[PDB]
């Protein structure tokens, strides 16, 4: 469960990210594809060339969904309901990959938020991304 302190840390950290969210989402995806090449098996229909506009566009979508989840951190299951439907019925990404993207999002945040990425904020962000992942896989079976 996300504590009130977790929510404070997540809102403060993502607030700092601000308009950079889309960029950071794309960076996290790039980091994921390079570090964990098995994740590319979900994007064979994508242009995965360096600096891919299609990947950047997807980074924006992922980031926007996260921004929405932060804005509705008290009720993420309802906020992400349509997205969770899509993941369960269409995308059907194996649950193990959500941890890989979450880690790459953390790495991206760490690389861009030198002052804000304290041990406590790190912990809260990890719980948050795990919670989002849980919602997105909640309807799988």
């Amino acid at each position: 469960v996300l504590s009130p302190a977790d929510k404070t840390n997540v809102k403060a950290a993502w607030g700092k990210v601000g308009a950079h969210a889309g960029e950071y989402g794309a960076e996290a995806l790039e980091r994921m594809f390079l570090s964990f090449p098995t994740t590319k098996t979900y994007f064979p229909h994508f242009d995965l060339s360096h600096g891919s506009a299609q990947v950047k566009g997807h980074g924006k979508k992922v980031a926007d969904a996260l921004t929405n989840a932060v804005a509705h951190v008290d009720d993420m299951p309802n906020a992400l309901s349509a997205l969770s439907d899509l993941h369960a019925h269409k995308l059907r990404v194996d649950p193990v990959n959500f941890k890989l993207l979450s880690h790459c999002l953390l790495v991206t945040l760490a690389a861009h938020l030198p002052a804000e990425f304290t041990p406590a904020v790190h912990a809260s962000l990890d719980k948050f991304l795990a919670s989002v992942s849980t919602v997105l896989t909640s309807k799988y079976r």
Binding site: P37, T38, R92, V93, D94
Partner: protein, 146 residues
């Protein structure tokens, strides 16, 4: 990696009693029932809407035959699983785009099917040997991903 000679004999002895075609269809079917997101790879196989639709699906059964056939062949090469499955690894990556996590899921469903078929004969030590095998096969099928 690292089966004991006693475990290799145990694996071989049990497998001699396995109907590979039958067990293959059953294992692939149960994969698609127990972890239904894995159906994402088999849209062309037709009706997968119920457990019975999946388990009795002729294309699922057929595919299960060739899958466990390759598995069966690999049991003759337990000291070189990575080499044995290298071309299938490359195919599943480059052509089929199958997340290798699926190989792990299939491995454990297969173990459940073996337990179901053999009952008490599928003893804890025999299971342990087969867990080494399915981990080795999954790791081998994952090895050429890039």
């Amino acid at each position: 990696v690292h089966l004991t000679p006693e475990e290799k004999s145990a694996v071989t002895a049990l497998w001699g009693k396995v109907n590979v075609d039958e067990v293959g269809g059953e294992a692939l079917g149960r994969l698609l029932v127990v972890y239904p997101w894995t159906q994402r790879f088999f849209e062309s196989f037709g009706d997968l809407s119920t457990p019975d639709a999946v388990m009795g699906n002729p294309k699922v059964k057929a595919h299960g035959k060739k899958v466990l056939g390759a598995f069966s062949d690999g049991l003759a090469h337990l000291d070189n699983l990575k080499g044995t499955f290298a071309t299938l690894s490359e195919l599943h990556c480059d052509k089929l785009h199958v997340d290798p996590e699926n190989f792990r899921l299939l491995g454990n469903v297969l173990v459940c099917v073996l337990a179901h078929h053999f009952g008490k004969e599928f003893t804890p030590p025999v299971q342990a040997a087969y867990q080494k095998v399915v981990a080795g096969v999954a790791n081998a099928l994952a090895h050429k991903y890039h």
